[PDB]
mmCIF file with all atom_site columns, C-alpha atoms in Angstrom:
data_model
loop_
_atom_site.group_PDB
_atom_site.id
_atom_site.type_symbol
_atom_site.label_atom_id
_atom_site.label_alt_id
_atom_site.label_comp_id
_atom_site.label_asym_id
_atom_site.label_entity_id
_atom_site.label_seq_id
_atom_site.pdbx_PDB_ins_code
_atom_site.Cartn_x
_atom_site.Cartn_y
_atom_site.Cartn_z
_atom_site.occupancy
_atom_site.B_iso_or_equiv
_atom_site.pdbx_formal_charge
_atom_site.auth_seq_id
_atom_site.auth_comp_id
_atom_site.auth_asym_id
_atom_site.auth_atom_id
_atom_site.pdbx_PDB_model_num
ATOM 1   C CA . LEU R 1 1   ? 12.564  -8.633  55.880  1.00 0.00 ? 1   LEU R CA 1
ATOM 2   C CA . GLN R 1 2   ? 12.926  -12.162 57.292  1.00 0.00 ? 2   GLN R CA 1
ATOM 3   C CA . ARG R 1 3   ? 10.789  -13.689 54.524  1.00 0.00 ? 3   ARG R CA 1
ATOM 4   C CA . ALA R 1 4   ? 12.771  -11.739 51.895  1.00 0.00 ? 4   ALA R CA 1
ATOM 5   C CA . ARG R 1 5   ? 16.014  -13.447 52.941  1.00 0.00 ? 5   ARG R CA 1
ATOM 6   C CA . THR R 1 6   ? 14.297  -16.843 52.548  1.00 0.00 ? 6   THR R CA 1
ATOM 7   C CA . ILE R 1 7   ? 13.150  -15.953 49.003  1.00 0.00 ? 7   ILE R CA 1
ATOM 8   C CA . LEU R 1 8   ? 16.579  -14.931 47.686  1.00 0.00 ? 8   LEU R CA 1
ATOM 9   C CA . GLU R 1 9   ? 18.259  -18.010 49.192  1.00 0.00 ? 9   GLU R CA 1
ATOM 10  C CA . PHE R 1 10  ? 15.765  -20.288 47.406  1.00 0.00 ? 10  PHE R CA 1
ATOM 11  C CA . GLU R 1 11  ? 16.423  -18.407 44.156  1.00 0.00 ? 11  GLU R CA 1
ATOM 12  C CA . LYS R 1 12  ? 20.173  -19.099 44.162  1.00 0.00 ? 12  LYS R CA 1
ATOM 13  C CA . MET R 1 13  ? 19.820  -22.901 44.353  1.00 0.00 ? 13  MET R CA 1
ATOM 14  C CA . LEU R 1 14  ? 17.818  -23.150 41.121  1.00 0.00 ? 14  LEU R CA 1
ATOM 15  C CA . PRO R 1 15  ? 19.309  -24.453 37.856  1.00 0.00 ? 15  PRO R CA 1
ATOM 16  C CA . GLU R 1 16  ? 19.948  -21.868 35.162  1.00 0.00 ? 16  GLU R CA 1
ATOM 17  C CA . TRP R 1 17  ? 17.390  -23.379 32.782  1.00 0.00 ? 17  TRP R CA 1
ATOM 18  C CA . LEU R 1 18  ? 14.738  -23.113 35.501  1.00 0.00 ? 18  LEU R CA 1
ATOM 19  C CA . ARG R 1 19  ? 15.671  -19.511 36.341  1.00 0.00 ? 19  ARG R CA 1
ATOM 20  C CA . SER R 1 20  ? 14.610  -18.634 32.787  1.00 0.00 ? 20  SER R CA 1
ATOM 21  C CA . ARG R 1 21  ? 11.158  -20.181 33.252  1.00 0.00 ? 21  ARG R CA 1
ATOM 22  C CA . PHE R 1 22  ? 10.295  -17.986 36.260  1.00 0.00 ? 22  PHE R CA 1
ATOM 23  C CA . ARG R 1 23  ? 10.931  -14.524 34.858  1.00 0.00 ? 23  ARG R CA 1
ATOM 24  C CA . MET R 1 24  ? 9.788   -11.258 36.416  1.00 0.00 ? 24  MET R CA 1
ATOM 25  C CA . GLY R 1 25  ? 8.780   -8.531  34.008  1.00 0.00 ? 25  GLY R CA 1
ATOM 26  C CA . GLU R 1 26  ? 8.022   -7.972  30.332  1.00 0.00 ? 26  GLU R CA 1
ATOM 27  C CA . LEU R 1 27  ? 10.051  -6.548  27.449  1.00 0.00 ? 27  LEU R CA 1
ATOM 28  C CA . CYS R 1 28  ? 8.779   -3.097  26.474  1.00 0.00 ? 28  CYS R CA 1
ATOM 29  C CA . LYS R 1 29  ? 9.725   -0.324  24.041  1.00 0.00 ? 29  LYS R CA 1
ATOM 30  C CA . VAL R 1 30  ? 9.925   2.805   26.179  1.00 0.00 ? 30  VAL R CA 1
ATOM 31  C CA . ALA R 1 31  ? 11.659  5.082   23.645  1.00 0.00 ? 31  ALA R CA 1
ATOM 32  C CA . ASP R 1 32  ? 13.078  5.127   20.131  1.00 0.00 ? 32  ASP R CA 1
ATOM 33  C CA . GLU R 1 33  ? 15.601  2.252   19.915  1.00 0.00 ? 33  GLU R CA 1
ATOM 34  C CA . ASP R 1 34  ? 15.295  1.536   23.654  1.00 0.00 ? 34  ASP R CA 1
ATOM 35  C CA . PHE R 1 35  ? 14.005  -1.833  24.905  1.00 0.00 ? 35  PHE R CA 1
ATOM 36  C CA . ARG R 1 36  ? 13.775  -2.402  28.659  1.00 0.00 ? 36  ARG R CA 1
ATOM 37  C CA . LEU R 1 37  ? 12.409  -5.078  30.968  1.00 0.00 ? 37  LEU R CA 1
ATOM 38  C CA . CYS R 1 38  ? 9.593   -3.536  33.005  1.00 0.00 ? 38  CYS R CA 1
ATOM 39  C CA . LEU R 1 39  ? 7.157   -4.372  35.814  1.00 0.00 ? 39  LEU R CA 1
ATOM 40  C CA . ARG R 1 40  ? 3.497   -3.323  35.556  1.00 0.00 ? 40  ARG R CA 1
ATOM 41  C CA . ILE R 1 41  ? 1.533   -1.707  38.415  1.00 0.00 ? 41  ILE R CA 1
ATOM 42  C CA . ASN R 1 42  ? -2.060  -0.413  38.183  1.00 0.00 ? 42  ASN R CA 1
ATOM 43  C CA . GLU R 1 43  ? -3.443  2.596   40.059  1.00 0.00 ? 43  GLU R CA 1
ATOM 44  C CA . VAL R 1 44  ? -6.634  4.630   40.656  1.00 0.00 ? 44  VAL R CA 1
ATOM 45  C CA . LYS R 1 45  ? -6.412  8.323   41.649  1.00 0.00 ? 45  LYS R CA 1
ATOM 46  C CA . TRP R 1 46  ? -9.494  10.471  42.323  1.00 0.00 ? 46  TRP R CA 1
ATOM 47  C CA . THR R 1 47  ? -7.990  13.774  43.507  1.00 0.00 ? 47  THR R CA 1
ATOM 48  C CA . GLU R 1 48  ? -5.788  15.294  40.768  1.00 0.00 ? 48  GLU R CA 1
ATOM 49  C CA . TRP R 1 49  ? -7.663  15.809  37.522  1.00 0.00 ? 49  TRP R CA 1
ATOM 50  C CA . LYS R 1 50  ? -5.487  16.529  34.485  1.00 0.00 ? 50  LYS R CA 1
ATOM 51  C CA . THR R 1 51  ? -5.543  16.146  30.727  1.00 0.00 ? 51  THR R CA 1
ATOM 52  C CA . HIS R 1 52  ? -3.408  13.115  29.863  1.00 0.00 ? 52  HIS R CA 1
ATOM 53  C CA . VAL R 1 53  ? -0.600  13.976  27.434  1.00 0.00 ? 53  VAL R CA 1
ATOM 54  C CA . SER R 1 54  ? 2.333   11.597  28.055  1.00 0.00 ? 54  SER R CA 1
ATOM 55  C CA . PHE R 1 55  ? 1.619   7.929   27.292  1.00 0.00 ? 55  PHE R CA 1
ATOM 56  C CA . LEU R 1 56  ? 3.092   4.997   25.381  1.00 0.00 ? 56  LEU R CA 1
ATOM 57  C CA . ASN R 1 57  ? -0.207  3.728   23.917  1.00 0.00 ? 57  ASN R CA 1
ATOM 58  C CA . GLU R 1 58  ? -3.274  5.573   22.616  1.00 0.00 ? 58  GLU R CA 1
ATOM 59  C CA . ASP R 1 59  ? -5.566  2.566   23.078  1.00 0.00 ? 59  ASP R CA 1
ATOM 60  C CA . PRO R 1 60  ? -5.978  1.890   26.807  1.00 0.00 ? 60  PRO R CA 1
ATOM 61  C CA . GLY R 1 61  ? -7.057  -1.741  26.967  1.00 0.00 ? 61  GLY R CA 1
ATOM 62  C CA . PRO R 1 62  ? -5.066  -4.826  27.765  1.00 0.00 ? 62  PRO R CA 1
ATOM 63  C CA . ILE R 1 63  ? -3.591  -5.445  24.321  1.00 0.00 ? 63  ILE R CA 1
ATOM 64  C CA . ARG X 2 1   ? -0.239  6.681   1.240   1.00 0.00 ? 1   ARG X CA 1
ATOM 65  C CA . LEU X 2 2   ? -2.513  9.701   1.577   1.00 0.00 ? 2   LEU X CA 1
ATOM 66  C CA . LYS X 2 3   ? -4.218  8.006   4.543   1.00 0.00 ? 3   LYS X CA 1
ATOM 67  C CA . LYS X 2 4   ? -0.932  7.660   6.448   1.00 0.00 ? 4   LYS X CA 1
ATOM 68  C CA . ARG X 2 5   ? 0.160   11.292  6.130   1.00 0.00 ? 5   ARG X CA 1
ATOM 69  C CA . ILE X 2 6   ? -3.201  12.653  7.314   1.00 0.00 ? 6   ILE X CA 1
ATOM 70  C CA . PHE X 2 7   ? -3.274  10.579  10.525  1.00 0.00 ? 7   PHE X CA 1
ATOM 71  C CA . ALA X 2 8   ? 0.356   11.540  11.171  1.00 0.00 ? 8   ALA X CA 1
ATOM 72  C CA . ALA X 2 9   ? -0.140  15.274  10.573  1.00 0.00 ? 9   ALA X CA 1
ATOM 73  C CA . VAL X 2 10  ? -3.318  15.391  12.656  1.00 0.00 ? 10  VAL X CA 1
ATOM 74  C CA . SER X 2 11  ? -1.515  13.862  15.652  1.00 0.00 ? 11  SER X CA 1
ATOM 75  C CA . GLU X 2 12  ? 1.508   16.177  15.603  1.00 0.00 ? 12  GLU X CA 1
ATOM 76  C CA . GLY X 2 13  ? -0.323  19.443  14.919  1.00 0.00 ? 13  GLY X CA 1
ATOM 77  C CA . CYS X 2 14  ? 0.736   20.304  11.356  1.00 0.00 ? 14  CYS X CA 1
ATOM 78  C CA . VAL X 2 15  ? -1.816  22.826  10.086  1.00 0.00 ? 15  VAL X CA 1
ATOM 79  C CA . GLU X 2 16  ? -0.150  23.833  6.816   1.00 0.00 ? 16  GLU X CA 1
ATOM 80  C CA . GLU X 2 17  ? 0.624   20.214  5.930   1.00 0.00 ? 17  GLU X CA 1
ATOM 81  C CA . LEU X 2 18  ? -2.986  19.180  6.587   1.00 0.00 ? 18  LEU X CA 1
ATOM 82  C CA . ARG X 2 19  ? -4.691  21.688  4.253   1.00 0.00 ? 19  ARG X CA 1
ATOM 83  C CA . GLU X 2 20  ? -2.541  20.466  1.354   1.00 0.00 ? 20  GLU X CA 1
ATOM 84  C CA . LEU X 2 21  ? -3.367  16.802  1.976   1.00 0.00 ? 21  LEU X CA 1
ATOM 85  C CA . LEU X 2 22  ? -7.081  17.653  1.985   1.00 0.00 ? 22  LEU X CA 1
ATOM 86  C CA . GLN X 2 23  ? -6.922  19.560  -1.317  1.00 0.00 ? 23  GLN X CA 1
ATOM 87  C CA . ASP X 2 24  ? -5.152  16.592  -2.908  1.00 0.00 ? 24  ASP X CA 1
ATOM 88  C CA . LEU X 2 25  ? -7.932  14.421  -1.479  1.00 0.00 ? 25  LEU X CA 1
ATOM 89  C CA . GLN X 2 26  ? -10.417 16.782  -3.146  1.00 0.00 ? 26  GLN X CA 1
ATOM 90  C CA . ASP X 2 27  ? -8.635  16.245  -6.468  1.00 0.00 ? 27  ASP X CA 1
ATOM 91  C CA . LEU X 2 28  ? -8.482  12.438  -6.297  1.00 0.00 ? 28  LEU X CA 1
ATOM 92  C CA . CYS X 2 29  ? -12.237 12.213  -5.695  1.00 0.00 ? 29  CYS X CA 1
ATOM 93  C CA . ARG X 2 30  ? -13.402 14.555  -8.467  1.00 0.00 ? 30  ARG X CA 1
ATOM 94  C CA . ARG X 2 31  ? -11.974 12.301  -11.199 1.00 0.00 ? 31  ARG X CA 1
ATOM 95  C CA . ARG X 2 32  ? -14.216 9.330   -10.537 1.00 0.00 ? 32  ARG X CA 1
ATOM 96  C CA . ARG X 2 33  ? -17.246 7.392   -11.769 1.00 0.00 ? 33  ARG X CA 1
ATOM 97  C CA . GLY X 2 34  ? -19.403 9.375   -9.326  1.00 0.00 ? 34  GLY X CA 1
ATOM 98  C CA . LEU X 2 35  ? -21.472 6.521   -7.873  1.00 0.00 ? 35  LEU X CA 1
ATOM 99  C CA . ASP X 2 36  ? -20.495 6.117   -4.182  1.00 0.00 ? 36  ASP X CA 1
ATOM 100 C CA . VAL X 2 37  ? -18.407 9.251   -3.550  1.00 0.00 ? 37  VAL X CA 1
ATOM 101 C CA . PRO X 2 38  ? -19.558 9.615   0.113   1.00 0.00 ? 38  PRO X CA 1
ATOM 102 C CA . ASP X 2 39  ? -18.728 5.918   0.534   1.00 0.00 ? 39  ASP X CA 1
ATOM 103 C CA . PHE X 2 40  ? -15.321 6.620   -1.024  1.00 0.00 ? 40  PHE X CA 1
ATOM 104 C CA . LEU X 2 41  ? -14.436 9.662   1.089   1.00 0.00 ? 41  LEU X CA 1
ATOM 105 C CA . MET X 2 42  ? -15.304 7.924   4.366   1.00 0.00 ? 42  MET X CA 1
ATOM 106 C CA . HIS X 2 43  ? -13.135 5.021   3.205   1.00 0.00 ? 43  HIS X CA 1
ATOM 107 C CA . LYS X 2 44  ? -10.101 7.323   3.226   1.00 0.00 ? 44  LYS X CA 1
ATOM 108 C CA . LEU X 2 45  ? -10.589 9.092   6.576   1.00 0.00 ? 45  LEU X CA 1
ATOM 109 C CA . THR X 2 46  ? -11.166 5.885   8.578   1.00 0.00 ? 46  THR X CA 1
ATOM 110 C CA . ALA X 2 47  ? -8.738  3.232   9.771   1.00 0.00 ? 47  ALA X CA 1
ATOM 111 C CA . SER X 2 48  ? -10.227 -0.008  8.500   1.00 0.00 ? 48  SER X CA 1
ATOM 112 C CA . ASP X 2 49  ? -9.274  -2.285  11.395  1.00 0.00 ? 49  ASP X CA 1
ATOM 113 C CA . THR X 2 50  ? -10.635 -0.225  14.308  1.00 0.00 ? 50  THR X CA 1
ATOM 114 C CA . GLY X 2 51  ? -13.137 2.257   12.882  1.00 0.00 ? 51  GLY X CA 1
ATOM 115 C CA . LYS X 2 52  ? -11.073 5.195   14.142  1.00 0.00 ? 52  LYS X CA 1
ATOM 116 C CA . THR X 2 53  ? -11.520 8.452   12.229  1.00 0.00 ? 53  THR X CA 1
ATOM 117 C CA . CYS X 2 54  ? -9.056  11.306  11.845  1.00 0.00 ? 54  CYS X CA 1
ATOM 118 C CA . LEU X 2 55  ? -11.320 13.395  14.083  1.00 0.00 ? 55  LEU X CA 1
ATOM 119 C CA . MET X 2 56  ? -10.839 10.814  16.848  1.00 0.00 ? 56  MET X CA 1
ATOM 120 C CA . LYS X 2 57  ? -7.076  10.779  16.206  1.00 0.00 ? 57  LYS X CA 1
ATOM 121 C CA . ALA X 2 58  ? -6.746  14.526  16.850  1.00 0.00 ? 58  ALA X CA 1
ATOM 122 C CA . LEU X 2 59  ? -8.740  14.466  20.091  1.00 0.00 ? 59  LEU X CA 1
ATOM 123 C CA . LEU X 2 60  ? -6.589  11.648  21.499  1.00 0.00 ? 60  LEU X CA 1
ATOM 124 C CA . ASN X 2 61  ? -3.477  13.837  20.978  1.00 0.00 ? 61  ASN X CA 1
ATOM 125 C CA . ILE X 2 62  ? -3.965  17.247  22.590  1.00 0.00 ? 62  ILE X CA 1
ATOM 126 C CA . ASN X 2 63  ? -1.640  19.799  20.968  1.00 0.00 ? 63  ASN X CA 1
ATOM 127 C CA . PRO X 2 64  ? -1.175  23.563  21.331  1.00 0.00 ? 64  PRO X CA 1
ATOM 128 C CA . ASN X 2 65  ? -3.026  23.859  17.980  1.00 0.00 ? 65  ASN X CA 1
ATOM 129 C CA . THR X 2 66  ? -5.794  21.248  18.402  1.00 0.00 ? 66  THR X CA 1
ATOM 130 C CA . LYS X 2 67  ? -8.719  23.700  18.273  1.00 0.00 ? 67  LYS X CA 1
ATOM 131 C CA . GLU X 2 68  ? -7.604  24.968  14.855  1.00 0.00 ? 68  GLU X CA 1
ATOM 132 C CA . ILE X 2 69  ? -7.334  21.455  13.382  1.00 0.00 ? 69  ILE X CA 1
ATOM 133 C CA . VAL X 2 70  ? -10.872 20.384  14.382  1.00 0.00 ? 70  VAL X CA 1
ATOM 134 C CA . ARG X 2 71  ? -12.395 23.420  12.632  1.00 0.00 ? 71  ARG X CA 1
ATOM 135 C CA . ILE X 2 72  ? -10.568 22.414  9.433   1.00 0.00 ? 72  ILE X CA 1
ATOM 136 C CA . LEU X 2 73  ? -11.932 18.852  9.452   1.00 0.00 ? 73  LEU X CA 1
ATOM 137 C CA . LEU X 2 74  ? -15.495 19.963  10.225  1.00 0.00 ? 74  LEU X CA 1
ATOM 138 C CA . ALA X 2 75  ? -15.555 22.658  7.527   1.00 0.00 ? 75  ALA X CA 1
ATOM 139 C CA . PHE X 2 76  ? -14.197 20.079  5.072   1.00 0.00 ? 76  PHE X CA 1
ATOM 140 C CA . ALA X 2 77  ? -16.827 17.407  5.764   1.00 0.00 ? 77  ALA X CA 1
ATOM 141 C CA . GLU X 2 78  ? -19.633 19.981  5.610   1.00 0.00 ? 78  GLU X CA 1
ATOM 142 C CA . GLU X 2 79  ? -18.958 20.862  1.965   1.00 0.00 ? 79  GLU X CA 1
ATOM 143 C CA . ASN X 2 80  ? -19.119 17.186  0.941   1.00 0.00 ? 80  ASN X CA 1
ATOM 144 C CA . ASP X 2 81  ? -22.539 16.588  2.608   1.00 0.00 ? 81  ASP X CA 1
ATOM 145 C CA . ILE X 2 82  ? -21.259 13.966  5.077   1.00 0.00 ? 82  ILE X CA 1
ATOM 146 C CA . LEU X 2 83  ? -21.188 16.022  8.291   1.00 0.00 ? 83  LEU X CA 1
ATOM 147 C CA . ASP X 2 84  ? -23.679 13.676  9.985   1.00 0.00 ? 84  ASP X CA 1
ATOM 148 C CA . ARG X 2 85  ? -21.914 10.340  9.453   1.00 0.00 ? 85  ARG X CA 1
ATOM 149 C CA . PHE X 2 86  ? -18.428 11.802  9.978   1.00 0.00 ? 86  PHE X CA 1
ATOM 150 C CA . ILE X 2 87  ? -19.194 13.219  13.427  1.00 0.00 ? 87  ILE X CA 1
ATOM 151 C CA . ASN X 2 88  ? -21.163 10.183  14.698  1.00 0.00 ? 88  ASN X CA 1
ATOM 152 C CA . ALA X 2 89  ? -18.892 7.316   13.644  1.00 0.00 ? 89  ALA X CA 1
ATOM 153 C CA . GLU X 2 90  ? -18.089 4.643   16.228  1.00 0.00 ? 90  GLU X CA 1
ATOM 154 C CA . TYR X 2 91  ? -15.420 2.115   17.061  1.00 0.00 ? 91  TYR X CA 1
ATOM 155 C CA . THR X 2 92  ? -16.226 -1.396  15.844  1.00 0.00 ? 92  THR X CA 1
ATOM 156 C CA . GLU X 2 93  ? -13.889 -3.699  17.797  1.00 0.00 ? 93  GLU X CA 1
ATOM 157 C CA . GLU X 2 94  ? -15.299 -5.525  20.809  1.00 0.00 ? 94  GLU X CA 1
ATOM 158 C CA . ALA X 2 95  ? -13.022 -3.764  23.312  1.00 0.00 ? 95  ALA X CA 1
ATOM 159 C CA . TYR X 2 96  ? -14.188 -0.208  22.575  1.00 0.00 ? 96  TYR X CA 1
ATOM 160 C CA . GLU X 2 97  ? -17.590 -0.686  20.901  1.00 0.00 ? 97  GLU X CA 1
ATOM 161 C CA . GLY X 2 98  ? -19.709 2.464   20.915  1.00 0.00 ? 98  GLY X CA 1
ATOM 162 C CA . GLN X 2 99  ? -17.070 5.099   21.694  1.00 0.00 ? 99  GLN X CA 1
ATOM 163 C CA . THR X 2 100 ? -17.499 8.346   19.755  1.00 0.00 ? 100 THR X CA 1
ATOM 164 C CA . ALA X 2 101 ? -15.654 11.634  19.317  1.00 0.00 ? 101 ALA X CA 1
ATOM 165 C CA . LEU X 2 102 ? -17.832 13.400  21.904  1.00 0.00 ? 102 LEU X CA 1
ATOM 166 C CA . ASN X 2 103 ? -16.822 10.668  24.386  1.00 0.00 ? 103 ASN X CA 1
ATOM 167 C CA . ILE X 2 104 ? -13.118 11.400  23.790  1.00 0.00 ? 104 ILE X CA 1
ATOM 168 C CA . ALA X 2 105 ? -13.498 15.186  24.107  1.00 0.00 ? 105 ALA X CA 1
ATOM 169 C CA . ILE X 2 106 ? -15.178 14.951  27.526  1.00 0.00 ? 106 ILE X CA 1
ATOM 170 C CA . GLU X 2 107 ? -12.544 12.566  28.952  1.00 0.00 ? 107 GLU X CA 1
ATOM 171 C CA . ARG X 2 108 ? -9.669  14.820  27.807  1.00 0.00 ? 108 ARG X CA 1
ATOM 172 C CA . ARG X 2 109 ? -11.393 17.717  29.689  1.00 0.00 ? 109 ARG X CA 1
ATOM 173 C CA . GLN X 2 110 ? -11.821 19.850  26.536  1.00 0.00 ? 110 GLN X CA 1
ATOM 174 C CA . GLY X 2 111 ? -14.616 22.199  27.537  1.00 0.00 ? 111 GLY X CA 1
ATOM 175 C CA . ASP X 2 112 ? -14.437 24.434  24.467  1.00 0.00 ? 112 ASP X CA 1
ATOM 176 C CA . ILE X 2 113 ? -14.321 21.678  21.834  1.00 0.00 ? 113 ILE X CA 1
ATOM 177 C CA . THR X 2 114 ? -17.334 19.917  23.406  1.00 0.00 ? 114 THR X CA 1
#
């Protein structure tokens, strides 16, 4: 929590052109006519086996 | 545009749409020179950039009517004498090289289709 206050105070003293260079997230199409900035997190789960039905991409590699 | 409607109908689970696209594929092939007809019919059922077949496209999209669709595509390829090369096609791109339709059916936990 103490380090988090230091991070946000450093972020406010940056110029607006340099705020655009350091940009969290990527633009993704999550639905029909719906574009949102999103953050990617990977995960491995060994205990609940299911057939995968809901996904945004058929091909599972880094594309 | 016959290639586009087959891959779309096989993903959504449209049985009655699929049988009509296959009969029109039967008609387009019979009026031909007759030299490389198995090379022509595998040119229609395969995406050219990835090597993905319409059998692979159905198994990636599990529907309430998936097990009926697979029987239609296998009975179709049997009567055109290409049942071997249709069921053992592979991906060609470097990311997924070697993956087959049996590989997809095991990962999707389809014990009856395997």
